[PDB]
Amino acid sequence: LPRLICINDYEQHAKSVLPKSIYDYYRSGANDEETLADNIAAFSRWKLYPRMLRNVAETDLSTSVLGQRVSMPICVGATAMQRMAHVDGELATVRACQSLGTGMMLSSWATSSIEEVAEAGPEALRWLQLYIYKDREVTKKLVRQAEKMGYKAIFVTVDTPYLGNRLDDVRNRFKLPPQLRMKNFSTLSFSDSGLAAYVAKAIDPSISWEDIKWLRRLTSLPIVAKGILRGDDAREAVKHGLNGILVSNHGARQLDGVPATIDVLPEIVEAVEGKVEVFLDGGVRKGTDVLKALALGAKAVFVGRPIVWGLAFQGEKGVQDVLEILKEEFRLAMALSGCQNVKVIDKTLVRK
Amino acid sequence: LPRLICINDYEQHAKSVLPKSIYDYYRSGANDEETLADNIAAFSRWKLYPRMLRNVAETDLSTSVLGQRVSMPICVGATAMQRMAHVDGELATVRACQSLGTGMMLSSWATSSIEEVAEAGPEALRWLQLYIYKDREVTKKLVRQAEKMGYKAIFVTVDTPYLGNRLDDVRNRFKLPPQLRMKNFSTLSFSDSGLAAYVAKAIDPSISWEDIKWLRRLTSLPIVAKGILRGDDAREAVKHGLNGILVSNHGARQLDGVPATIDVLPEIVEAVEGKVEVFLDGGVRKGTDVLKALALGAKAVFVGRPIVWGLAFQGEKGVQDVLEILKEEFRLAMALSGCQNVKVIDKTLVRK
Amino acid sequence: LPRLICINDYEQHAKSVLPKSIYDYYRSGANDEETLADNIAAFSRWKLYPRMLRNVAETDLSTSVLGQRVSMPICVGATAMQRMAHVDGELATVRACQSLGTGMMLSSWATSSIEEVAEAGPEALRWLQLYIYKDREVTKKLVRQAEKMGYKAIFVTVDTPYLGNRLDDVRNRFKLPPQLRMKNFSTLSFSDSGLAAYVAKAIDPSISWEDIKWLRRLTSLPIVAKGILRGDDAREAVKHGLNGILVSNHGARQLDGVPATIDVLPEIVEAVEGKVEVFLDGGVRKGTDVLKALALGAKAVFVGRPIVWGLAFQGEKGVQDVLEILKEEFRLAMALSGCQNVKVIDKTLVRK
Amino acid sequence: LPRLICINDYEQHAKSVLPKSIYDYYRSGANDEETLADNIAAFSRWKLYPRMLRNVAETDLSTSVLGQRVSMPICVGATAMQRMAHVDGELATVRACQSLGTGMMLSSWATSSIEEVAEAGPEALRWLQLYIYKDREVTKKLVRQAEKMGYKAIFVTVDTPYLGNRLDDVRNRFKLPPQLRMKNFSTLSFSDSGLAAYVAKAIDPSISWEDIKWLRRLTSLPIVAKGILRGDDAREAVKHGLNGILVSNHGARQLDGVPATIDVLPEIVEAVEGKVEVFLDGGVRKGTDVLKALALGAKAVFVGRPIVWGLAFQGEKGVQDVLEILKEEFRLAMALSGCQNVKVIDKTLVRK
Numbered sequence A, B, C, D: 001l002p003r004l005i006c007i008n009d010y011e012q013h014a015k016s017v018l019p020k021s022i023y024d025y026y027r028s029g030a031n032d033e034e035t036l037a038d039n040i041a042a043f044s045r046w047k048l049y050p051r052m053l054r055n056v057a058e059t060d061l062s063t064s065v066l067g068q069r070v071s072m073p074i075c076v077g078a079t080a081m082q083r084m085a086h087v088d089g090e091l092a093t094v095r096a097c098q099s100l101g102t103g104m105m106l107s108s109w110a111t112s113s114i115e116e117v118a119e120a121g122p123e124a125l126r127w128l129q130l131y132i133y134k135d136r137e138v139t140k141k142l143v144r145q146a147e148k149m150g151y152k153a154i155f156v157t158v159d160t161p162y163l164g165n166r167l168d169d170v171r172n173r174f175k176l177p178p179q180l181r182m183k184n185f186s187t188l189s190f191s192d193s194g195l196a197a198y199v200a201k202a203i204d205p206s207i208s209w210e211d212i213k214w215l216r217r218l219t220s221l222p223i224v225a226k227g228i229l230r231g232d233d234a235r236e237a238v239k240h241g242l243n244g245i246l247v248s249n250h251g252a253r254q255l256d257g258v259p260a261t262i263d264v265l266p267e268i269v270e271a272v273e274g275k276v277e278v279f280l281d282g283g284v285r286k287g288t289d290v291l292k293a294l295a296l297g298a299k300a301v302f303v304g305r306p307i308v309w310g311l312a313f314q315g316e317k318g319v320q321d322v323l324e325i326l327k328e329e330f331r332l333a334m335a336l337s338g339c340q341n342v343k344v345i346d347k348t349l350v351r352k
């Protein structure tokens, strides 16, 4: 009988139940997976310096993301094609987010439509993750749908001019199961790695800061740059009028040998000088990871793979369980470190 | 036939004879057990710079803890529920301490009573480890019993507003064997982890420095703060009139990802400026560990798990054997490093 | 059915098909193979700081080596006796280089003649790797043949006064398969390790900077010093009128315990002050390795073992496949790091 | 058929042929064997920066130890009870040393007599390793015998007031095979670890610098302090008129957790300011180890365990083979690093 009490248990259970090609697609990093290992190892190098005797009977995990209240600084990151993991895919995910009172970043290519997800999760805090397609009419349609269907921000992914080289996907000749489809667009629906070639056909490798200007003019919605790893690029994003930075290495699935996100976070927080919120994804598996990211000045963190593992175990209930595990680990890490609320999580809590 | 000649052998023997759930309870750290590994690895990073030709024919291991003479700077730390390991539990432990001429820190929740332990070990140096219960009358009763029964200090544990998340205990659904009871208090006797929920019900998560003031007013007994890991908290403990700091991460069982105790010891010794004795626990398994802790300015060290392993092997005789092993390793480490007595163990003996 | 999608797969396939003594000869480093491991591990320590939104739709990999255009900054290094790996040996290699539009460094002892290789690869960019033989007439003949047959530079190997001690070759009592011969010279044709004793008989251990002066006077061809690991030696090579430095530890096959080539590259680039091109070999297995070497100021890199593994798999087609794998990994690493061409690969892309 | 081409092969062969208790006695370090691992690992951290084109056709390995010429800076260290490894024990060893033209340090407790060893090796360079026995008449007799029988120095061991705690020896209840005896003295002949208790009975733990003064007055022979790990002690040895320092941690068999000898060597070389020769033992297994020790300012190195492994394989011939392996590795390391002789091995050859 499954007894899954931490994120790692969910991954182990997912490996046991998913087809190998699908588990490999979800698990993989790029090339030799150096950054994949480092996203996790880096968190272990940051040590915690807990304060005692601070009164933690009433721990308040609540915060805000881009002015929208959330129950905890732990939000769902964009993961493509969620119906591969569970028949309810993105609808299971958004229902879990609504229950938890946190936000869902929806992949511009999901196996579910912008409208279907807003319908399933009307009261959920919802954001759209955008790629800049070679087809700018496709791209504008996605932004307009997001605006009309009550999405609260655009996360524009800037680290994927081309897909990374995930060796298992190349070996398995990965493609979507037959009955599934990217449901916001034939060849654009994703009817070697089939995904790499799909991207080579649909995603624009020419995107530049000029296209960020276009997007900033297209929508008044808050825009976050997702995939920044350098302070100079972070400063450029602020200069282009963007409203946030998601420090991300794409789950270590793009360029291998980039630093862990927790290691580059302080340089990015320093570079933006408090002008915009900074977020982190990559390697978040435990409450202490959330605490270290907030101590180093992230407003909130996003989780990618853990959500897929929850779906694989039991759809909406499995996503809810994963998010509740992270919530309760984060509560306990705050309490044991002497933090009553997120506003008193300070830089002195951590040292590398 | 058991031939146990070092602490690690006692652990291996304990694993072979204890029920898995009990061995797991004793062995575990919190979450991924990063700090548990580091408590041991950290000692190996501190290298010894021995002096030669100093005349070590007459090595004197004796010292004092809070003005009470002990035979060696190696004392028994508080470990709950010792009758799980051996039918004689805390009584076996205190008899061994009396034989060795060292001190026993008694867990405020032992499977034996403050009076039963003072009766078994009348000539033993004995201290009480205190939790601040939500029930302050319970808490005062424990302090008064400790005073009446000849205990020489209070170690107030400050790092446990809630219990840490020990995964094995959650998986094993840990609880005390049926015939046992915390014998100083029904639900307060400890009739997921049952221990985590017990603490959530009995231990006060609201404790603050104000409660330390209350305790300092309640008793004239020496009070040591157990669980401090930051210099600022150590300085606060001194300002509250406390008489010692036990640098402890609770055997790595509370917040995971805190530093090893041997690594934070020098910051704490520096912070208290010689106003109070500083002690260390966490990872002590060898005579050289004791030597490194004293070289970095600890007065004495406490051992937790090694004592449980001694009880598991042969009750009082097994505790005595464990303490004699540590005594003789510590004698040999002093002799080979050129130290005739504890007063000449200096900071130049170690370098990280 | 072989499905070889990265350099490591080619090595694994080579181990499966080559006689053990031949695979061991190709794989080995010197002594305990510390530098062999480090040539690879060192690349992983250099982290990439990619720029986003730079427009990488049109990536241009082309560069030049000593004024000769190449398709990519990835060239074939000298590896002796290539007919052990495949019946077509050096002819397979040069044909693959001609197809790719990159250069081949031909081993002065190949199982194929300077003329045979120029005949097979007339349009290929070709250089000769030279040892200074005790027989200077032999040595001059090789240089003159290289000049007459359209070779564009001399790489003089300076780190092999004697052969390194490769333990497997000593254990296997290594020697060339019977039908093969070093085809540019009986005992000089290579008719414990037979190779070590061959070198002890043919290669001059007395070579000094005076012999570099002799070589500089012998030919007007560009000369590169191969095997430099110190800045002072690099500065000496420039003072002797040489035209390049190949930072090399001989694939970790000579002196064990020297640093990784990627770690010494920056000291050498600094020492030559832009007077000559600096190249690197040792441990190049991935596109990101090429990118890190160019970010640290190498003009191009050479690959040794990967080429042998390509030959072992399928001769010319296997060499072509290996070079195309490296080309495409390097294209993707440039694109994901925001580099449109090799001239914009800058030092800020990397940090150790 | 044994094919032993490096020191490690000799150890592997010794494990295969010796009784477990004897192999364990020879192999062991103290306690958890942290320093034992580090004596070897430390050498790997020191990297070599070889010079090229220096003319190494004529490599001269010769040097001098305390004014006596040797063939190579590689000498035999004192290892007790050599007849356990081979019936010819110390006589096999001294004959091998005479053949090689290097020196033998004879253990004051050997299974062979000071006279027997001088008889077997009349032309060998021979030194006596001395313990200060509680019996000073025993101690004086050994020194006088050494003087009369043509020994050229006294190595006084200063790191063994008591024997280290070698766990395997305690578990195996180690003692000499029955027919053997320490042949320079009943209980003094060595008729838990029997060795630890023997030392507790024969070796004086009270030895101080005052006893060094006594020894300096007893003999005009050169005296080297063996077991120094601190610069202050090295400076004290010079002030007492001693003529050398052997940087040694006793093969990591005494105090565990001391640094590797190669790591403390530079501090000791700096402390003695060129007043006396500094030597190293501990972890020497390869020619590159010898080169790194001389680059950091040791005059010569001693080998302990490798000599025992040679005896175990084939007595005198096995010792000769081990010493010839080290000689030839050291020749090759000098040649590949550009060193014609030991006088040009400089500090720029190494960097940690």
Ligand SMILES: Cc1cc2nc3c(=O)[nH]c(=O)nc-3n(C[C@H](O)[C@H](O)[C@H](O)COP(=O)(O)O)c2cc1C
Residues within 6 Å of the ligand: A025, A026, A027, A039, A077, A078, A079, A080, A107, A108, A109, A129, A157, A226, A248, A249, A250, A251, A252, A253, A281, A282, A283, A284, A302, A303, A304, A305, A306, A308
């Ligand atoms: C299966 C999978 C699919 C992903 N799909 C997308 C995507 O559609 N859009 C996107 O911007 N990022 C995508 N990412 C990256 C994630 O948004 C996120 O940056 C990453 O998963 C965070 O690291 P973690 O998995 O360690 O939590 C995907 C990641 C995974 C593992």
Ligand SMILES: Cc1cc2nc3c(=O)[nH]c(=O)nc-3n(C[C@H](O)[C@H](O)[C@H](O)COP(=O)(O)O)c2cc1C
Residues within 6 Å of the ligand: B025, B026, B027, B039, B077, B078, B079, B080, B107, B108, B109, B129, B157, B226, B248, B249, B250, B251, B252, B253, B281, B282, B283, B284, B302, B303, B304, B305, B306, B308
């Ligand atoms: C089984 C077990 C029970 C413990 N019970 C208590 C307790 O009742 N009170 C307390 O303050 N600390 C308790 N601790 C923590 C110990 O006092 C001590 O800080 C820790 O064991 C020291 O580390 P060591 O086990 O590595 O020697 C316990 C530790 C263990 C392993």
Ligand SMILES: Cc1cc2nc3c(=O)[nH]c(=O)nc-3n(C[C@H](O)[C@H](O)[C@H](O)COP(=O)(O)O)c2cc1C
Residues within 6 Å of the ligand: C025, C026, C027, C039, C077, C078, C079, C080, C107, C108, C109, C129, C157, C226, C248, C249, C250, C251, C252, C253, C281, C282, C283, C284, C302, C303, C304, C305, C306, C308
């Ligand atoms: C099998 C083999 C043969 C080699 N033969 C030569 C040679 O003839 N001349 C030479 O200068 N270097 C020779 N080398 C060294 C290579 O030119 C080159 O420096 C090294 O292979 C680069 O490292 P890599 O194998 O990690 O790519 C050889 C290396 C190998 C593995």
Ligand SMILES: Cc1cc2nc3c(=O)[nH]c(=O)nc-3n(C[C@H](O)[C@H](O)[C@H](O)COP(=O)(O)O)c2cc1C
Residues within 6 Å of the ligand: D025, D026, D027, D039, D077, D078, D079, D080, D107, D108, D109, D129, D157, D226, D248, D249, D250, D251, D252, D253, D281, D282, D283, D284, D302, D303, D304, D305, D306, D308
């Ligand atoms: C089996 C054995 C016996 C030893 N006996 C002695 C001894 O009699 N006197 C002494 O001063 N050192 C003794 N030593 C220490 C050695 O002289 C030397 O310091 C050590 O072996 C050097 O390290 P290595 O074994 O790594 O080469 C002994 C070491 C070993 C391994």
Ligand SMILES: CNC(=O)c1n[nH]c2ccc(Br)cc12
Residues within 6 Å of the ligand: A080, A081, A109, A190, A195, A250, A251, A253
């Ligand atoms: C890591 N990323 C993916 O696997 C991914 N990222 N963006 C995508 C768009 C479509 C598809 Br299908 C997959 C992805």
Ligand SMILES: CNC(=O)c1n[nH]c2ccc(Br)cc12
Residues within 6 Å of the ligand: B080, B081, B109, B190, B195, B250, B251, B253
């Ligand atoms: C690590 N700690 C424990 O396991 C512990 N610490 N304090 C306690 C009080 C009661 C019980 Br039961 C167990 C404990």
Ligand SMILES: CNC(=O)c1n[nH]c2ccc(Br)cc12
Residues within 6 Å of the ligand: C080, C081, C109, C190, C195, C250, C251, C253
């Ligand atoms: C690593 N190097 C070799 O294995 C090598 N290097 N130069 C050579 C010349 C002839 C032969 Br055969 C082999 C080699």
Ligand SMILES: CNC(=O)c1n[nH]c2ccc(Br)cc12
Residues within 6 Å of the ligand: D080, D081, D109, D190, D195, D250, D251, D253
């Ligand atoms: C490591 N050392 C030994 O094992 C050793 N060192 N000194 C000795 C004297 C007698 C005997 Br037996 C053994 C030893």
